[PDB]
Amino acid sequence: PREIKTLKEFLAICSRKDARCVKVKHNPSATKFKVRCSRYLYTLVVNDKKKADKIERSIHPSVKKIAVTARSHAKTNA
Amino acid sequence: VAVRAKVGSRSYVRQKQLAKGKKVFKIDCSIPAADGIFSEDVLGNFEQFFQDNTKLNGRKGKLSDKVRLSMNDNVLTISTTMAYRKKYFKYLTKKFLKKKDLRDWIRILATGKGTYQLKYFN
Amino acid sequence: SCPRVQYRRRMHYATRGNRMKMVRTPGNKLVMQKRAKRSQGIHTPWVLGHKRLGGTKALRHIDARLASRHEKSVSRAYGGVLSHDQVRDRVVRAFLVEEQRIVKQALKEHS
Amino acid sequence: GRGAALARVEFRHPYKFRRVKELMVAPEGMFTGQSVFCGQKAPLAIGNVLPL
Amino acid sequence: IKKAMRKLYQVKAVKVNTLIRPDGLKKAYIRLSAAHDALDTANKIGLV
Amino acid sequence: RKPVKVHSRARWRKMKEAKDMGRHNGVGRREGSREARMPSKELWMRRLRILRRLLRKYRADKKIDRHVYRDLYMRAKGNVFRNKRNLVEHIHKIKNEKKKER
Amino acid sequence: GRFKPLAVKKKYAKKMNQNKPVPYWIRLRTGNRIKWNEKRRHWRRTKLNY
RNA sequence: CGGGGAAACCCAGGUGGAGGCCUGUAGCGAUGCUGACGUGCAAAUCGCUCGUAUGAUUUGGGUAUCGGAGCGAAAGACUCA
RNA sequence: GCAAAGAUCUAACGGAGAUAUACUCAACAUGCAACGUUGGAUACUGGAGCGGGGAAGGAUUUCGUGCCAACGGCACUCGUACACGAGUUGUUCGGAAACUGAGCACAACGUUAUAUCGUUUUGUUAGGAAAGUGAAGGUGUGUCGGCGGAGCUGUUCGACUGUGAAAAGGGGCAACAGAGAACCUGGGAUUAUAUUCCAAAAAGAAAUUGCAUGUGGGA
RNA sequence: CCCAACUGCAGACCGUACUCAUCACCGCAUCAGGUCCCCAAGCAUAGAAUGCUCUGGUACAUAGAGAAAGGUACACUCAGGGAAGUCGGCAAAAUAGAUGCGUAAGUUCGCAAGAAGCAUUGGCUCUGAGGGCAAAAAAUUGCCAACUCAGAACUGCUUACGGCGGGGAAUCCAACUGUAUAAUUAAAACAUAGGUUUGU
RNA sequence: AGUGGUAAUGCGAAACACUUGCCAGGUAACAAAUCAAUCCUCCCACGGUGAGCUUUCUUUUCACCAUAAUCCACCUUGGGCCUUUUUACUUUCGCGUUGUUCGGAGCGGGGGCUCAAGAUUGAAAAAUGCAGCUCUUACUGUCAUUUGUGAGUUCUGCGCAUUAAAGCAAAAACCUGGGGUGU
Ligand SMILES: [K+]
Ligand SMILES: [K+]
Ligand SMILES: [K+]
Ligand SMILES: [K+]
Ligand SMILES: [K+]
Ligand SMILES: [K+]
Ligand SMILES: [K+]
Ligand SMILES: [K+]
Ligand SMILES: [K+]
Ligand SMILES: [K+]
Ligand SMILES: [K+]
Ligand SMILES: [K+]
Ligand SMILES: [K+]
Ligand SMILES: [K+]
Ligand SMILES: [K+]
Ligand SMILES: [K+]
Ligand SMILES: [K+]
Ligand SMILES: [K+]
Ligand SMILES: [K+]
Ligand SMILES: [K+]
Ligand SMILES: [K+]
Ligand SMILES: [K+]
Ligand SMILES: [K+]
Ligand SMILES: [K+]
Ligand SMILES: [K+]
Ligand SMILES: [K+]
Ligand SMILES: [Mg+2]
Ligand SMILES: [Mg+2]
Ligand SMILES: [Mg+2]
Ligand SMILES: [Mg+2]
Ligand SMILES: [Mg+2]
Ligand SMILES: [Mg+2]
Ligand SMILES: [Mg+2]
Ligand SMILES: [Mg+2]
Ligand SMILES: [Mg+2]
Ligand SMILES: [Mg+2]
Ligand SMILES: [Mg+2]
Ligand SMILES: [Mg+2]
Ligand SMILES: [Mg+2]
Ligand SMILES: [Mg+2]
Ligand SMILES: [Mg+2]
Ligand SMILES: [Mg+2]
Ligand SMILES: [Mg+2]
Ligand SMILES: [Mg+2]
Ligand SMILES: [Mg+2]
Ligand SMILES: [Mg+2]
Ligand SMILES: [Mg+2]
Ligand SMILES: [Mg+2]
Ligand SMILES: [Mg+2]
Ligand SMILES: [Mg+2]
Ligand SMILES: [Mg+2]
Ligand SMILES: [Mg+2]
Ligand SMILES: [Mg+2]
Ligand SMILES: [Mg+2]
Ligand SMILES: [Mg+2]
Ligand SMILES: [Mg+2]
Ligand SMILES: [Mg+2]
Ligand SMILES: [Mg+2]
Ligand SMILES: [Mg+2]
Ligand SMILES: [Mg+2]
Ligand SMILES: [Mg+2]
Ligand SMILES: [Mg+2]
Ligand SMILES: [Mg+2]
Ligand SMILES: [Mg+2]
Ligand SMILES: [Mg+2]
Ligand SMILES: [Mg+2]
Ligand SMILES: [Mg+2]
Ligand SMILES: [Mg+2]
Ligand SMILES: [Mg+2]
Ligand SMILES: [Mg+2]
Ligand SMILES: [Mg+2]
Ligand SMILES: [Mg+2]
Ligand SMILES: [Mg+2]
Ligand SMILES: [Mg+2]
Ligand SMILES: [Mg+2]
Ligand SMILES: [Mg+2]
Ligand SMILES: [Mg+2]
Ligand SMILES: [Mg+2]
Ligand SMILES: [Mg+2]
Ligand SMILES: [Mg+2]
Ligand SMILES: [Mg+2]
Ligand code: NA
Ligand code: NA
Ligand code: NA
Ligand code: NA
Ligand code: NA
Ligand code: NA
């Protein structure tokens, strides 16, 4: 996995054609934006909640967004 | 380890003391008392039991001012300036429930960090 | 009780190429993972001492093939083959032996 | 299986651009870095190969 | 096997796993792409 | 799923308390040789590393110079000092004598 | 164990297919003389050794 | 590292860890009971006792040498009871 | 005779396998003895294990259901028995493709009335012409840089052919423990397979080949 | 056409169940025999010895009743004597761990040697000794872990788990370690280092 | 048509590009004992959750408390080397090991270069695993938790590496250079 350092680099990753989805992980401290590209999973970590909310709204609607939750065994059976 | 121990030294074992004290343990006996199993005399016996059975510095009964018991609002509060394991007051609770012979009727569970609670078996 | 493990790849012999380490997994299981073999690293010629060269890493096969050319050499002449003391000896010996030939050849021509 | 030391002696190829690397039985006193002369015009020193 | 599934049943196989059975026959585990429903093609074959 | 059957170390832990105080290790309780219970090479390695560690610290603290250190370094290897206190008392004797010559 | 040639695995597979009893309807034919398979094999009795 | 001695050299503590070295597991063998069994568990096994156990050591797979021939630290041993 | 490896006990359920009675008679003195499962009790193995893996060898003994004629030297309701139906999933694991070793022996040559014999790794076949591969250069194609006035000349790199430097020593096999080898966690994914199965939030995170397209830098 | 950062597509072939043994293999068999490799817990203890135990596994080996003689044993004991038994101390008994002291002839000076022999050993409560780190005659000041040895006082013994050399004086043979008649002979036989001779 | 540093040697988004025309080295590639010992294992401590015991003792006994490949940045130990001081070694040198060593053919000291084993930080990754618990049925939800100067441990240091009249396979494949191409 690769880590994104800046916001400008994060936006370039999300604009790629191989950018199937963005997974938003809400840790108690920081928020992680894991972009699922073809070869690598790029993650931008934002410690500030105010900044993290701005980034989530600024993600283009063309790319799919997923809120990462804990799915149950029953939610995935069969 | 560093200094060889003595058998006579078992009359007093030094206990660790918190630098910033006031650690509190709460034992909620509301459910047994609400149903009538824990009556006012049993409530006094429960508070008295912890007073003369809590071993401080290897000694049982002489709680001094370091250990304070305050049974208010049907719960038991244990405020200490010493490093006491929370498991000690679940182990002391079962000794009381066994002597009074209700270890098969009332179970003690953990609700929050620093709180125990008395319930009924499902 | 110490957990007991099994070989997980189809080779079940304790040879130098089949060394394994015990690994505790996120599922709290103890498994065996094969240790990768190591190379001795880039050395000087055996007739010149067989000593590990400076500025060169010890990479094995796939690792040496995908690594950049600087992990395996220096910028000096004979970099990654000879050492600094062996290169300096050749530079001095190349110049000095050539000079003796010129002096001896000039002495022959003068007579 | 042999009690005498062996010497690898490096020669140049007389016709090609390559080294030869002979291997012969070392005489006593042969050392690494010694110059070995083999031929009609070779001097009479220990380790040199000369016609009888 | 992937080409034959295309010609016969007009489906795309994203993965084929094959084993030779202990009675000598070869059995194929053919997984179809998400565009194709395996139950719908099973019904068309006749094995429902 | 039932719990595992109990294998308690309570008896071993009270024995450990007694053995730490010196009990149950007498001459009648010893079945292995003296240098199989504690090897003599382990006692020598421990002592020589202690003696060398102190000598390096005294040199780094300028308590002794390189000529006193080198003399005591070889005397330590030659089994002249039995323990750390024996070496220190020798250092003090050297220092006191060097004061008188000064 | 795990290793066998495919040719050896295919001989063992045929021997597995031949290790079946005679069908019931074979016994009802006109000039029938077969009642049981006389070439039945058990892994513990006789060894193929392929 | 010390102590003697003119010298030659000698004498003491420690360190070190050699050896087809010792005691002893696993392994490899097979001394005695002339034990058990002797239509046996077994067409040579079982028990205790015993030899060796860093080496001329034990062992897997592969490979080479056979019928008047092979191979043998040599018993006419062994070469699919 | 069925005596080495200590050892089983109890209740309930299951089962045809019971608590099975002319008369007399309350029950003992007239249905015995033995099974499988579960829960308890007791014990053994005691990590050089009646533990969990694999090689050789075996080849369906694996799994579920049914079954008790014969077989498991006593018993069986149990079974590695019998019947029926199932089960083995890989870019990365092992092998091969693709390495050499102790070695083998196809070709070649020789021998033999007889090839079904010999040589065939001490760098290496054969009196022995065993190389079909190709540095530069010449000829055209494509991709370029550069000068002069999209075209031409010379020039770098790829493809194409008529001249051809240099490469001595035929072709193979022989290691599932030597060399070599890009994947490893979670799973509610089975009755039986799983670093092999999982499908869009692949539970997922990767690493590697072989080709292409586009962007960027040279030509 | 050559390079990097990607990306798109593709990733063929065989093996894969189970076993690996007091029942899956060889020995006519589900035979106390044989069969390579990996993982290997706690306590006692020098410990992969031996004994017991948590995890995993197992209660499977025809069983029940039950003091005849005579047996077999990975079972014991025996007064007084002590090898008088017997071809012969066969078999059994016996010694035994650790620590200290002490130890003969002979010798290739390495040994013999654990020669031979005396002594102690428990349990408790103490006391010494053996260290690490940090702090500006620091030759002191705090804090702290893992064990070991030595010495006392008190207090016991029915000498009481297992595991664990009996010793000495001589003679004959072979120097030694090794090998060796699978299935009656392990020896003094064979090998050996050392010595000599022969052919070239 | 590479480039920086006195030097040890550093620098990769693609001209620091092509090299099996040719040549030469290296990896593959082999090794005792002692001593340190990695992953892991077992013991301690510290603390939570559940369970066992509780006439009487036991701040108690038992279980669990996990973090896979692959990448990012990168102070601890050990080795090799560089530069500077060498007025470094004797009637008496110094550094170092448990241990047999070493030094004007350059020891020690200051400052650095490099290699090998490891910390440490992060992406993966908690979204997983485990255990408990709450609501109340559904293989249902919610919620709590996630130190060792100890003993082993051959991965490693570790080889021109063992007794030795014993001196411990090879090859494919790959790596780098020398010449040359680019010119
Ligand atoms: K296998
Ligand atoms: K396997
Ligand atoms: K046959
Ligand atoms: K054997
Ligand atoms: K061998
Ligand atoms: K023959
Ligand atoms: K012959
Ligand atoms: K019987
Ligand atoms: K029935
Ligand atoms: K054990
Ligand atoms: K695998
Ligand atoms: K032939
Ligand atoms: K094999
Ligand atoms: K998959
Ligand atoms: K058997
Ligand atoms: K004890
Ligand atoms: K029997
Ligand atoms: K009797
Ligand atoms: K009897
Ligand atoms: K008795
Ligand atoms: K007597
Ligand atoms: K007689
Ligand atoms: K003695
Ligand atoms: K001789
Ligand atoms: K090593
Ligand atoms: K070593
Ligand atoms: Mg190395
Ligand atoms: Mg397959
Ligand atoms: Mg010693
Ligand atoms: Mg001095
Ligand atoms: Mg097998
Ligand atoms: Mg077979
Ligand atoms: Mg020996
Ligand atoms: Mg015999
Ligand atoms: Mg007999
Ligand atoms: Mg008989
Ligand atoms: Mg003996
Ligand atoms: Mg022995
Ligand atoms: Mg033995
Ligand atoms: Mg004879
Ligand atoms: Mg009878
Ligand atoms: Mg019998
Ligand atoms: Mg029995
Ligand atoms: Mg019934
Ligand atoms: Mg009845
Ligand atoms: Mg028991
Ligand atoms: Mg044992
Ligand atoms: Mg067992
Ligand atoms: Mg076992
Ligand atoms: Mg079955
Ligand atoms: Mg029967
Ligand atoms: Mg069948
Ligand atoms: Mg060969
Ligand atoms: Mg030949
Ligand atoms: Mg020839
Ligand atoms: Mg091959
Ligand atoms: Mg090898
Ligand atoms: Mg291999
Ligand atoms: Mg593979
Ligand atoms: Mg299975
Ligand atoms: Mg499989
Ligand atoms: Mg399997
Ligand atoms: Mg099994
Ligand atoms: Mg096995
Ligand atoms: Mg049996
Ligand atoms: Mg058989
Ligand atoms: Mg002990
Ligand atoms: Mg043991
Ligand atoms: Mg039984
Ligand atoms: Mg008597
Ligand atoms: Mg006897
Ligand atoms: Mg004497
Ligand atoms: Mg005489
Ligand atoms: Mg002899
Ligand atoms: Mg011997
Ligand atoms: Mg023999
Ligand atoms: Mg015999
Ligand atoms: Mg002889
Ligand atoms: Mg003689
Ligand atoms: Mg080497
Ligand atoms: Mg990891
Ligand atoms: Na298998
Ligand atoms: Na020794
Ligand atoms: Na039962
Ligand atoms: Na079938
Ligand atoms: Na058990
Ligand atoms: Na007698």
mmCIF file of N, CA and C in Angstrom, chain F residues 33-68:
data_model
loop_
_atom_site.group_PDB
_atom_site.id
_atom_site.type_symbol
_atom_site.label_atom_id
_atom_site.label_comp_id
_atom_site.label_asym_id
_atom_site.label_seq_id
_atom_site.Cartn_x
_atom_site.Cartn_y
_atom_site.Cartn_z
ATOM 1 N N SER F 33 26.732 -32.051 39.750
ATOM 2 C CA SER F 33 28.035 -31.562 40.172
ATOM 3 C C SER F 33 27.992 -30.059 40.424
ATOM 4 N N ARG F 34 28.989 -29.576 41.165
ATOM 5 C CA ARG F 34 29.037 -28.158 41.502
ATOM 6 C C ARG F 34 29.148 -27.301 40.250
ATOM 7 N N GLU F 35 29.946 -27.739 39.278
ATOM 8 C CA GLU F 35 30.124 -27.014 38.030
ATOM 9 C C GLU F 35 29.144 -27.457 36.949
ATOM 10 N N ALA F 36 28.145 -28.260 37.305
ATOM 11 C CA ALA F 36 26.968 -28.466 36.470
ATOM 12 C C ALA F 36 25.787 -27.618 36.902
ATOM 13 N N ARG F 37 25.694 -27.288 38.191
ATOM 14 C CA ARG F 37 24.681 -26.350 38.660
ATOM 15 C C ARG F 37 25.060 -24.922 38.292
ATOM 16 N N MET F 38 26.257 -24.491 38.686
ATOM 17 C CA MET F 38 26.826 -23.234 38.209
ATOM 18 C C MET F 38 28.196 -23.546 37.619
ATOM 19 N N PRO F 39 28.371 -23.438 36.306
ATOM 20 C CA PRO F 39 29.679 -23.733 35.713
ATOM 21 C C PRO F 39 30.736 -22.742 36.164
ATOM 22 N N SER F 40 31.980 -23.222 36.219
ATOM 23 C CA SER F 40 33.080 -22.371 36.654
ATOM 24 C C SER F 40 33.462 -21.352 35.589
ATOM 25 N N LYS F 41 33.197 -21.658 34.315
ATOM 26 C CA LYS F 41 33.475 -20.704 33.247
ATOM 27 C C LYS F 41 32.484 -19.549 33.262
ATOM 28 N N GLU F 42 31.240 -19.809 33.668
ATOM 29 C CA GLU F 42 30.257 -18.738 33.787
ATOM 30 C C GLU F 42 30.608 -17.790 34.927
ATOM 31 N N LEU F 43 31.170 -18.321 36.014
ATOM 32 C CA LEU F 43 31.612 -17.471 37.114
ATOM 33 C C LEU F 43 32.821 -16.637 36.717
ATOM 34 N N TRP F 44 33.727 -17.210 35.923
ATOM 35 C CA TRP F 44 34.896 -16.463 35.475
ATOM 36 C C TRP F 44 34.515 -15.389 34.469
ATOM 37 N N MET F 45 33.649 -15.726 33.512
ATOM 38 C CA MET F 45 33.252 -14.752 32.504
ATOM 39 C C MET F 45 32.537 -13.573 33.142
ATOM 40 N N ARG F 46 31.665 -13.847 34.113
ATOM 41 C CA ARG F 46 30.967 -12.776 34.811
ATOM 42 C C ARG F 46 31.938 -11.871 35.555
ATOM 43 N N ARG F 47 32.916 -12.458 36.247
ATOM 44 C CA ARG F 47 33.858 -11.655 37.018
ATOM 45 C C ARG F 47 34.754 -10.820 36.114
ATOM 46 N N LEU F 48 35.283 -11.418 35.044
ATOM 47 C CA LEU F 48 36.217 -10.696 34.185
ATOM 48 C C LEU F 48 35.521 -9.578 33.420
ATOM 49 N N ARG F 49 34.255 -9.776 33.055
ATOM 50 C CA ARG F 49 33.504 -8.710 32.400
ATOM 51 C C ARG F 49 33.189 -7.581 33.374
ATOM 52 N N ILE F 50 32.934 -7.916 34.640
ATOM 53 C CA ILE F 50 32.720 -6.895 35.661
ATOM 54 C C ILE F 50 33.994 -6.093 35.886
ATOM 55 N N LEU F 51 35.136 -6.778 35.979
ATOM 56 C CA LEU F 51 36.402 -6.102 36.239
ATOM 57 C C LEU F 51 36.811 -5.212 35.073
ATOM 58 N N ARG F 52 36.583 -5.669 33.840
ATOM 59 C CA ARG F 52 36.921 -4.862 32.672
ATOM 60 C C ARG F 52 35.976 -3.678 32.520
ATOM 61 N N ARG F 53 34.702 -3.862 32.872
ATOM 62 C CA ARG F 53 33.733 -2.777 32.771
ATOM 63 C C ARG F 53 34.071 -1.643 33.728
ATOM 64 N N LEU F 54 34.516 -1.979 34.939
ATOM 65 C CA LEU F 54 34.896 -0.954 35.903
ATOM 66 C C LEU F 54 36.162 -0.229 35.470
ATOM 67 N N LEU F 55 37.124 -0.961 34.904
ATOM 68 C CA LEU F 55 38.367 -0.341 34.459
ATOM 69 C C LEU F 55 38.119 0.647 33.325
ATOM 70 N N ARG F 56 37.214 0.310 32.405
ATOM 71 C CA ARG F 56 36.878 1.233 31.326
ATOM 72 C C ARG F 56 36.197 2.486 31.862
ATOM 73 N N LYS F 57 35.343 2.331 32.877
ATOM 74 C CA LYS F 57 34.658 3.479 33.462
ATOM 75 C C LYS F 57 35.628 4.382 34.217
ATOM 76 N N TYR F 58 36.591 3.794 34.931
ATOM 77 C CA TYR F 58 37.578 4.596 35.644
ATOM 78 C C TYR F 58 38.477 5.357 34.678
ATOM 79 N N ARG F 59 38.822 4.742 33.546
ATOM 80 C CA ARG F 59 39.608 5.440 32.535
ATOM 81 C C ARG F 59 38.803 6.555 31.878
ATOM 82 N N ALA F 60 37.520 6.308 31.606
ATOM 83 C CA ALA F 60 36.682 7.336 30.999
ATOM 84 C C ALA F 60 36.417 8.488 31.959
ATOM 85 N N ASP F 61 36.435 8.223 33.261
ATOM 86 C CA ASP F 61 36.254 9.248 34.278
ATOM 87 C C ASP F 61 37.570 9.874 34.715
ATOM 88 N N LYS F 62 38.677 9.505 34.071
ATOM 89 C CA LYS F 62 40.006 10.052 34.332
ATOM 90 C C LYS F 62 40.510 9.727 35.733
ATOM 91 N N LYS F 63 39.897 8.747 36.402
ATOM 92 C CA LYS F 63 40.403 8.325 37.703
ATOM 93 C C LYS F 63 41.743 7.615 37.572
ATOM 94 N N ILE F 64 41.954 6.889 36.476
ATOM 95 C CA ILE F 64 43.232 6.258 36.185
ATOM 96 C C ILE F 64 43.638 6.628 34.767
ATOM 97 N N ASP F 65 44.942 6.590 34.508
ATOM 98 C CA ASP F 65 45.464 6.874 33.184
ATOM 99 C C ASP F 65 45.633 5.575 32.398
ATOM 100 N N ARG F 66 46.197 5.686 31.194
ATOM 101 C CA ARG F 66 46.353 4.519 30.338
ATOM 102 C C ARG F 66 47.430 3.567 30.837
ATOM 103 N N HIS F 67 48.317 4.025 31.720
ATOM 104 C CA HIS F 67 49.378 3.155 32.216
ATOM 105 C C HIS F 67 48.934 2.374 33.444
ATOM 106 N N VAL F 68 48.110 2.981 34.299
ATOM 107 C CA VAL F 68 47.505 2.232 35.395
ATOM 108 C C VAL F 68 46.450 1.271 34.861
#
